[PDB]
Write a protein that binds this ligand. Structure first.
Ligand code: HEC
Ligand code: HEC
Lengths: 158, 160
């Protein structure tokens, strides 16, 4: 069962329930370490849809129909009873990518990258390749996904 | 109703949980060794999960039910710079800690929570901790029922 919902023009409707998908890793790019303006502020919590997680465990590959959501959250504090560091605050928005060789035959890896203006937007905005795909293609460890930062994926593959 | 998550010995000790990466993630924080005198208490990234049945009850009530299992998975800092910018990026898994709320198994523990450490991922079972080792700090500073929900935006957004 596919977890994306799409328009006739193959655009990703804003995913619902992705926090109940399979978490694959979190990173943090604080504003204060990125000239007071991180590209994706600031914590990133990343999810893969459950069907594609199942296929990943079987094959170590992203199936046609894979949806990955990167959820952004602010840095809420830098010190807690557990020590110094970064601790999350409030949610900021999402980014997403969808793999589909039928809908996206001309895109690298058959991935479409979606930006979201806000959580109330009805749909994502598909991006031209220089804005997202170029960086992922140049630097991601596996099939345009930064699996070097997803220890769940690396431990879960066969 | 949902399944009960976690498995327990006859002495009510949590057996080392399996499949928790398919539970509901509730938030991640990072205490890097380099910001904690080269030795964070829990090195270093923490990815936290609540079992799915207790997540369902949380969405309905904003409370942790009897049978709640929360797992905090530790991972290293793998790096501090990537194409997305400077910060902290995870490395390899380090270990787990857990807490279980159960008024029947742990009637005399603060909040009916049992705190478990794990010697390694290969250990058969956790080691239940004394109150001063874990519960004291959680009770003193956690925002809700001994859980640090100030750092779990998924929980705060999911409660009614
Ligand atoms: C995180 C991301 C994800 C998660 C899947 C993944 O491959 O990591 C999505 C869906 C996404 N981005 Fe990309 N991005 C970059 C890196 C290094 C990471 C992982 C580490 C971290 O969380 O900080 C990402 C890198 C880059 C990049 C390098 C210069 C660019 C220009 C972009 N990303 C751009 C975009 C998008 C353009 C709008 C977009 C929709 C993204 N990323 C989606
Ligand atoms: C994270 C933790 C979790 C996850 C649930 C939670 O309430 O956040 C577990 C299951 C657990 N710890 Fe505790 N802990 C502290 C803090 C602030 C955080 C959240 C922020 C972060 O991830 O860094 C925790 C704090 C403290 C603490 C304060 C001085 C003490 C001494 C301990 N924790 C101790 C313990 C454990 C004793 C061995 C134990 C099993 C823990 N924590 C479990």
């Amino acid at each position: 069962l596919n977890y994306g919902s799409f328009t006739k023009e193959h655009v990703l409707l804003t995913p619902k329930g992705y926090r109940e998908w399979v978490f694959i890793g979190a990173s943090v790019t604080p504003n204060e370490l990125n000239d007071d303006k991180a590209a994706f502020p600031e914590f990133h919590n990343v999810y893969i849809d459950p069907t594609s997680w199942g296929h990943w465990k079987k094959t170590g590959e992203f199936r046609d129909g894979t949806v990955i959501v990167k959820e952004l959250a602010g840095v809420g504090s830098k010190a807690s009873p557990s020590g110094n560091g970064y601790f999350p605050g409030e949610f900021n928005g999402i980014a997403a990518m969808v793999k589909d060789s039928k809908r996206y035959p001309e895109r690298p890896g058959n991935w479409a990258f979606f930006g979201f203006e806000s959580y109330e937007a009805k749909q994502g905005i598909i991006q031209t390749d220089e804005t997202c795909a170029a960086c992922h293609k140049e630097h991601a460890a596996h099939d345009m996904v930064f699996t070097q930062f997803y220890p769940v994926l690396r431990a879960g593959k066969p």
